[PDB]
Symmetry: D2
Subunit: 257 residues, 4 copies
């Protein structure tokens, strides 16, 4: 495949519905070697089995809230991999009151801090910690949502963070770019995942996108996965600092009328 | 003038070079009543001199890092003003290492937290605390920079925060729009202010903009001030969720070639 | 007012619902001297009556399809006005089939050509023709629609033209900028005007914007007029190459959910 | 490869430097069957030599200025291929004066017409003529330049056309999307090609992008080609109405400082 011999580290794999699972599925198909992260202990078993499904024994704990676990992630990884060809940042979090109802009702300094700490900052943080072992033509990838560009109901505080996230894509790309490293994001359309359940009217978003997107259909983790594998590969060696929409074209229209 | 009888609260006035001072001059010229904030105690005297310069006795302390000072700002203001017609958010801060040199060099979890806390969160925080006394056609205004939209050298962590800020503009507009309140931003060009001294090689950006911007000239706080007065006034009652470029058109070109 | 002594030529005044009529009124209110254009002979009486309402006798024919009338427009104006301080391009046209139903169904080489000829080329065409008598800090203004940025139902071929138009703003601004001239556009929200009747299901868009826009209301030509007057004035001297949304914030959200 | 059994029609292949050659080059590698177009007779021999290099005998004349040749193109193709899985629009033209020096100096109603006729209209025009034989999951691709988004020196009238083109991408995606067809564009960075020679100071742009783009390097037709092959394949079935930047990240920075 077009990722032969590339070693890629995936975060955010939580279930077989997770976006990170779809990307994983595609990277494996195209010849990648995979390593995974998890947060919390009880999940050690499930992720090790996910890793086993993809022919990997390489699983590491990493709660991006802790500086210690981040540094420790790549110290451990260096003992297995001399270098890293790809990193996928598929992580997001917000206190549910901060992603439900009115934007201001759930706005607190503490909810703001956490959403940005976990959903935005953690990406260049992981980039910084991996830099000592990144290959010369490595590729970093994160996941964003249209909610950064425009105000979407219920997304609220999470839209602020993703705007910061998409900005870090551009700044990371400049910083790591001279070395030949690429940094991009996929702005995925709505997909039913564990995190999605935290969004109050998620079901309303799904039907609307299915109805109004140019392709008249929602996206799948297979579609996001192929797009991700592409950006992680040398096929996209001319592409960096990009926010690519894989949302059946929804971002480019005004639907509902 | 076109702000007659409008009561506007101004933050971020620190010197006669500050952007908030330019807006203040224009608002007063157009007939507004002004109130000002300061941070720290030692600054209590200077802002009063500036406040008197605009025919005002209304000064209140507000370090937007402290939840308490924010709430007290509008409780104290409420004893003087029945309602609030305009709010100007002219606040910015980042640890200087986070706005100097390489993006990752100055990237630390704590630098990220602070820049976003002060430069982004503080805007909707002030909006939420002010909400009880905002008029039907009140107008909130914040200041941004092109560094949120594209990667500009040295702007670094502040670019991430400014991206969140511009996103908060949109979500604020949706939340407060139903009540009739408008929320906008000016993406201002480079102005040599106290804050400007914190961005290393600020001088090259000024030279570059003066040379390559369509109008072949940098902008002034007089110009940004007039632009602010427009947005705070009933002249712009059809304008909300907007990021207005006041940078002699620089954002719209690829200069240097 | 803030247009004292400014001489402004307004095109596209056809009725008291026209956007150009709202702009004229705001410009007159703020102290400008006005001149108007019309297309065809029959309309000569109609515009002359409109010009009198604004204390003007300066009316000139100009069908922008004809190169001759454009050059002749500013030859005639020159005999009355030594210089021109503002020019408003409120012109648009396309065969109705090209702005009805499906995009491809109404696509013909000729429909494409005309839409772009009248709605796009005529703006920089008039700019070029006016330059010999434009003042040092003159201001050019055109009207666009969100249909340039994103695909809107039934707008179709007109969306292509508006994208060219918004591009012409940027290239014009660089071209005319060294002289000190500013060039901007207003992206107006839906307004019930004569041109509006050519957009099938215009009413559906009106209802949708009123329901989903942040301010929960459609805009008026008075709001667009004040915004236009601002951009034409020296209050906006730091503003060029800008496409400013005056649409109650509709552009910044994903409505319907 | 990942384009096995897909039949793709390529336009705009003129030399071994052409962008269309890089795409052809990638599509064949990935298992596609190719057919090509040429314009003028004199080039008939040359393109057949190219088509043979990619194992094809299918070559057809098509000057996209003539409605007749467009219709005839897909009539002839229909005799060899029952269906079409891919269409590549790699076509552009403008009078040399309209892409040289000042924007207004080279502006004529006629130069404008030609640039928009060939570089913009010709794309959805070909899409429409192909529609009767497009596969259900076929994929259309065009080439654009950053000059549509921002004002670039010397690009001038061509930037307007490319802006209309990028809009036609969005409206096409909606029109053809219900059928399952995808429409995208690649906004390519500078490539030294035959068309490139029409832009004064092409080299000045090359030097600047290599110096300021995040990857500190210009792009190649191989890189644009792989990106093109991706979008034409079912790997990007979740991607439509997209303008993908393949320019080493240049669009995302403010360079020169
Ligand atoms: N599913 C969608 O509709 C959708 C759409 C657009 C973007 N996204 C983005 O995709 C990414 C993945 O979300 P998903 O929908 O695939 O869901 P998911 O809920 O299965 O995954 C979210 C992941 O975040 C991880 N995470 C949360 N807090 C963490 C922390 N402190 N440290 C480490 N990991 C932490 C969890 O372990 C989990 O695997 C997120 O960034 C989300 O914003 C999702
Ligand atoms: N100067 C420029 O070129 C420029 C360009 C674009 C945007 N901006 C933005 O304009 C705004 C004002 O900057 P300026 O250039 O006028 O500068 P200035 O340095 O004179 O003012 C900055 C203000 O921030 C305030 N501030 C900092 N930390 C604070 C805190 N914790 N709590 C409360 N207030 C705090 C200071 O009191 C000061 O009044 C900022 O938001 C800045 O991002 C500036
Ligand atoms: N009404 C809206 O909802 C709306 C929204 C966004 C933008 N606009 C823009 O507003 C402008 C028109 O304002 P309006 O829509 O209120 O309409 P209007 O119908 O009153 O004006 C359209 C004008 O175009 C002029 N015109 C048409 N063909 C012409 C030609 N060949 N030569 C010269 N003039 C010609 C007509 O004389 C008329 O005055 C257009 O540029 C249109 O794109 C309108
Ligand atoms: N070269 C670059 O740096 C660059 C960058 C961005 C976008 N582009 C776009 O890429 C496309 C191809 O350009 P290129 O640089 O690969 O160059 P190229 O000059 O080799 O190809 C241009 C093609 O246009 C075709 N063409 C022109 N007029 C035509 C007509 N009337 N009918 C049919 N075909 C016609 C020619 O056959 C030729 O193959 C163009 O659309 C151009 O806008 C080029
Ligand atoms: C609306 C589509 C969408 C976007 C997400 O970022 C998303 O992921 C999160 C949402 C809120 C908080 C944390 C997330 F990871 C889930 C989702 F369904
Ligand atoms: C355009 C250059 C520029 C941008 C700013 O946002 C700016 O304002 C700040 C930047 C960093 C930290 C605090 C600021 F107020 C100052 C300045 F000179
Ligand atoms: C949908 C909102 C809208 C936008 C226009 O550009 C508009 O103006 C025109 C539309 C089609 C043809 C000519 C026009 F001036 C009218 C209108 F109602
Ligand atoms: C500056 C990058 C660039 C863009 C083009 O569209 C391009 O192709 C053309 C340029 C002008 C006129 C017709 C073209 F096809 C060549 C080129 F070098």
């Amino acid at each position: 495949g077009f990722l032969d011999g590339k070693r890629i580290l995936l975060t955010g794999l939580l279930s077989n519905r997770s976006i990170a699972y779809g990307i994983a599925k595609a990277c494996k198909r195209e010849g990648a070697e995979l390593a995974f992260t998890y947060v919390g202990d009880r999940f050690k078993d499930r992720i090790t089995e996910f890793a086993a499904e993809f022919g990997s024994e390489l699983v590491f704990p990493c709660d991006v809230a802790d500086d210690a676990q981040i540094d420790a992630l790549f110290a451990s990884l260096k003992t297995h991999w001399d270098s890293l060809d790809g990193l996928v940042h598929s992580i997001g979090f917000a206190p549910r009151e901060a992603i439900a109802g009115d934007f201001l009702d759930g706005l607190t300094r503490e909810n703001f801090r956490i959403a940005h700490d976990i959903s935005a900052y953690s990406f260049p943080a992981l980039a910084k910690a991996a830099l000592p072992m990144l290959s010369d033509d490595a590729s970093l990838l994160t996941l964003s949502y249209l909610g950064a560009e425009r105000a979407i109901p219920n997304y609220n505080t999470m839209g602020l963070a993703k705007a910061a996230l998409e900005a870090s894509v551009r700044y990371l790309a400049v910083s790591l770019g001279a070395k030949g490293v690429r940094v991009n994001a996929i702005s995925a359309g709505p997909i039913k995942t564990l995190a999605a359940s935290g969004i109050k009217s998620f079901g309303k978003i799904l039907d609307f996108v299915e109805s109004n997107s140019p392709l008249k259909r929602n996206v799948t983790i297979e579609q996001v996965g192929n797009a991700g594998a592409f950006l992680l590969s040398d096929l996209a060696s001319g592409v960096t600092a990009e926010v690519m929409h894989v949302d059946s074209g929804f971002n480019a229209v005004v639907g509902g009328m």
